[PDB]
Amino acid sequence: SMRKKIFKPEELRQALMPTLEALYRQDPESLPFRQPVDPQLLGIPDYFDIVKNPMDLSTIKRKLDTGQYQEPWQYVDDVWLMFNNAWLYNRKTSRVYKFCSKLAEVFEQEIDPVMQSLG
Numbered sequence: 675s676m677r678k679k680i681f682k683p684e685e686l687r688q689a690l691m692p693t694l695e696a697l698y699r700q701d702p703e704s705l706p707f708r709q710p711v712d713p714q715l716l717g718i719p720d721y722f723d724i725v726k727n728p729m730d731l732s733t734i735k736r737k738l739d740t741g742q743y744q745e746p747w748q749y750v751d752d753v754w755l756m757f758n759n760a761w762l763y764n765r766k767t768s769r770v771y772k773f774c775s776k777l778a779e780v781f782e783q784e785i786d787p788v789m790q791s792l793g
């Protein structure tokens with residue numbers, strides 16, 4: 675055992691950053707996820723009425739760079755928050771929804787062997 679394993683920030687960064695890079699490499703699918711949503715600039719002013727906890731790729735990257743994840747599952751939770759936000763907000767025919775579904779397929783594939791490596 676019950677002694678909690680400690681993960682050091684550079685260990686998490688080396689292990690998890692490639693999985694984030696794999697999401698960035700999806701193009702066009704990552705393009706709507708690369709920056710924080712600005713609802714007025716994007717023409718979606720209802721966004722924060724629906725999505726209470728925004729998350730995007732640039733924020734996840736900054737959190738890894740600044741040691742804000744103590745456990746790999748906290749990083750997984752933010753990636754999944756980003757996915758769940760987009761499945762909640764967008765209509766099922768929209769680009770962002772279908773792009774989200776593809777990013778979730780890619781992330782599932784990438785994160786699995788990394789979680790095995792971290793344990």
Ligand SMILES: COc1ccc2c(c1)N(CCC/C=C/c1cccc3c1N[C@H](C)CC(=O)N3)CCO2
Nearest residue numbers: 702705706707711716718759760761763764769770
């Ligand atoms: C919109 O779809 C595409 C598809 C391809 C693209 C672009 C846009 N743009 C603009 C990228 C920035 C746009 C974000 C965005 C806009 C409207 C609704 C949502 C957006 N995303 C976040 C996750 C919030 C959300 O849930 N929905 C770049 C070229 O490639």
